[PDB]
Amino acid sequence: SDWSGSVPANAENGKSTGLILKQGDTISVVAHGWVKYGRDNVEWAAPDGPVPNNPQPSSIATLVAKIANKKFAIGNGVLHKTVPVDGELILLFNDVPGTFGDNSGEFQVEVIIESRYSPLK
Numbered sequence: 001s002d003w004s005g006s007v008p009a010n011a012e013n014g015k016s017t018g019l020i021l022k023q024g025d026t027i028s029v030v031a032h033g034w035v036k037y038g039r040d041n042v043e044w045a046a047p048d049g050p051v052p053n054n055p056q057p058s059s060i061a062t063l064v065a066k067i068a069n070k071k072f073a074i075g076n077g078v079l080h081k082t083v084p085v086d087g088e089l090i091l092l093f094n095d096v097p098g099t100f101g102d103n104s105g106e107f108q109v110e111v112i113i114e115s116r117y118s119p120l121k
């Protein structure tokens, strides 16, 4: 993997991967494991999001990619997706701001930069 590490659910600013992406690059991601987005026994999330017996609002408590303050869905993973904007890849458990204090656990995530942008010409 270009980067492998943990994404803590309680990190309100996510986990910086150090991968500096450019528009037109392609990346793949897979994310494993389980986190809590609250203290109650039902408030569990996979990267794809809350367990559906306790749904939360759109995008909340899901694993997203933050690139230059833009957010993109990742969830359990993506394959060979084109990057739309330049920026460092930050992986984030997208809880509601200010509600990370009751979060626990971490995802195990792998990122591969499948290609760096180069046009056919």
Ligand SMILES: OC[C@H]1O[C@H](OC[C@H]2O[C@H](O[C@]3(CO)O[C@H](CO)[C@@H](O)[C@@H]3O)[C@H](O)[C@@H](O)[C@@H]2O)[C@H](O)[C@@H](O)[C@H]1O
Binding pocket: 037, 038, 039, 040, 043, 056, 057, 060, 061, 095, 096, 099, 100, 102
């Ligand atoms: O949406 C993100 C948010 O989800 C959870 O909070 C929403 C949850 O709040 C209330 O649930 C309880 C009731 O006591 O209140 C706390 C809120 O932190 C929960 O632990 C507990 O279940 C509502 O009554 C529920 O309908 C609603 O789903 C999570 O707790 C927050 O930290 C935040 O991540």
Ligand SMILES: [Ca+2]
Binding pocket: 036, 037, 038, 095, 099, 100, 101, 102, 103
């Ligand atoms: Ca929370």
